């Protein structure tokens, strides 16, 4: 694949994050990315060539396959993985902006050495005191919360879309009724059992990730209330 | 074919018959027998090999053909021709019995030459006077009438059966729904137009024959009333 850039960026962002965020990144790296690339994507290797129908009408097989699978599961999961990673990058960008502000303020104070008072109050407001121990307060906390909410809503929306379109199982026999197939025809899928097992596994993984980020949000809210 | 024996017997029986009976025998020989043997039977030469359906399920073609054609038209017409010829043979047998009685009575009278009175009354009762001019009176008339009625009822029964089973036309496309064919399949006949034309022609011929024998019955009833 080509997941090198996204993996590198996630490795860059995982340095400064909460424990729940680190666990979420770890499970995303292990189960969502590694498992799909290694063995899951090989199952959908001949979902088109092994598909066949019980007719001799030309062109009915392509129409029935297009009717049966509007979009492959592997591509759907890739799109989901892409769409549940942007807000972390947004948080990384905001952290880098905070770092730039810290560097400029440090340069100004080094130049200086009531200005000290305002420099210190600005360094405390952004949570930059130890030169490498950026804390979450004011803006970073807001960005983190909105990122968590966006990730959760994207995941639940994708789950609902998948539930509406396909369901959570693949029957061994599919009934096709569309031109130019005369009347109704019978078509047979390929590897229904493995696909059902992997779909259930991915559903479980998605639910676990949802619960994990919910726990992370609750913990960060409690930490904010602590102050 | 093997119609030689029946044709010979009909040639034997046509010697002594009414004009309507002779015309009926002529039309039966010309249109019913000659036409069917010459060209009509060749049309149903590949009604099985040219039949095909739009499926690749093994054994569906035979089942659909058996569903479509319970009995071929040619065999039905042959059976009809056979079943609308027996009563003429029965009349021929009765005429031969009358001839035997005439020969025995002639032998007895030649032996003799009040007995003359009874011989003459028996020769008049059976209508045997001129030694070769047998007339219809008493028993022959009854046999002729019952033969005509039996022929008419057989013909109308066969016509009704054909109307109930097939109809009077063959559509170019037939819909088949029977195991092991999955759902419904489309099957295509062979030479629908020629078969429809010949079916209509045979129906017209049968109606003409029915009208002819009705006219013959009316004429013979009038002749009987004449006495
Ligand atoms: C049931 C758990 C409920 C809490 C779950 C909390 C989340 C969880 O499960 O792991 C993350 C957590 C915090 O780790 P993290 O390094 O971020 O935080 C440490 C500590 O918990 C305080 O946050 C700070 O020290 P102190 O306290 O001011 O001296 C300081 O962090 P910070 O403030 O400078 O950033 C750290 O010493 O790890 C723990 O071991 C918590 C202690 C209890 C671990 C044992 C379980 C009670
Ligand atoms: C509209 C027709 C209505 C009648 C249709 C009648 C049926 C029809 O169309 O053809 C058969 C018919 C009878 O022929 P067939 O030879 O059986 O009978 C002749 C005749 O008609 C009488 O029956 C008898 O003679 P006669 O009269 O006693 O001297 C004698 O027969 P039979 O008694 O010994 O067995 C015969 O001379 O032929 C005709 O030419 C009828 C005369 C009219 C022909 C012209 C048309 C009027």
UniProtKB/Swiss-Prot annotation, chains A, B:
Entry's disease: Oculodentodigital dysplasia: A disease characterized by a typical facial appearance and variable involvement of the eyes, dentition, and fingers. Characteristic facial features include a narrow, pinched nose with hypoplastic alae nasi, prominent columella and thin anteverted nares together with a narrow nasal bridge, and prominent epicanthic folds giving the impression of hypertelorism. The teeth are usually small and carious. Typical eye findings include microphthalmia and microcornea. Oculodentodigital dysplasia, autosomal recessive: A disease characterized by a typical facial appearance and variable involvement of the eyes, dentition, and fingers. Characteristic facial features include a narrow, pinched nose with hypoplastic alae nasi, prominent columella and thin anteverted nares together with a narrow nasal bridge, and prominent epicanthic folds giving the impression of hypertelorism. The teeth are usually small and carious. Typical eye findings include microphthalmia and microcornea.
Modified residues (Phosphoserine): 4
Gene Ontology CC: apical plasma membrane; cell junction; cell-cell contact zone; connexin complex; cytoplasm; endoplasmic reticulum membrane; focal adhesion; gap junction
Source organism superkingdom: Eukaryota
Name this protein carries in UniProt: Gap junction alpha-1 protein
Organism of derivation: Homo sapiens (Human)
Keyword Heme: no
Encoding gene per record: GJA1
Role, per record: Gap junction protein that acts as a regulator of bladder capacity. A gap junction consists of a cluster of closely packed pairs of transmembrane channels, the connexons, through which materials of low MW diffuse from one cell to a neighboring cell. May play a critical role in the physiology of hearing by participating in the recycling of potassium to the cochlear endolymph. Negative regulator of bladder functional capacity: acts by enhancing intercellular electrical and chemical transmission, thus sensitizing bladder muscles to cholinergic neural stimuli and causing them to contract.
GO biological process: atrial cardiac muscle cell action potential; bone development; bone remodeling; cardiac conduction system development; cell communication by electrical coupling; cell communication by electrical coupling involved in cardiac conduction; cell-cell signaling; cellular response to amyloid-beta
Subunit annotation: A connexon is composed of a hexamer of connexins. Interacts (via C-terminus) with TJP1. Interacts (via C-terminus) with SRC (via SH3 domain). Interacts (not ubiquitinated) with UBQLN4 (via UBA domain). Interacts with SGSM3 and CNST. Interacts with RIC1/CIP150. Interacts with CSNK1D. Interacts with NOV. Interacts with TMEM65. Interacts with ANK3/ANKG and PKP2.
Disulfide-linked positions: 53-181, 176-187
PTM per Swiss-Prot/TrEMBL: Sumoylated with SUMO1, SUMO2 and SUMO3, which may regulate the level of functional Cx43 gap junctions at the plasma membrane. May be desumoylated by SENP1 or SENP2.
Covalent cross-link (Glycyl lysine isopeptide (Lys-Gly) (interchain with G-Cter in SUMO)), residues: 133, 226
Expression (tissue specificity): Expressed at intercalated disks in the heart (at protein level). Expressed in the fetal cochlea.
Entry keyword annotation includes Ribonucleoprotein: no
Extracellular membrane side: 44-75, 166-196
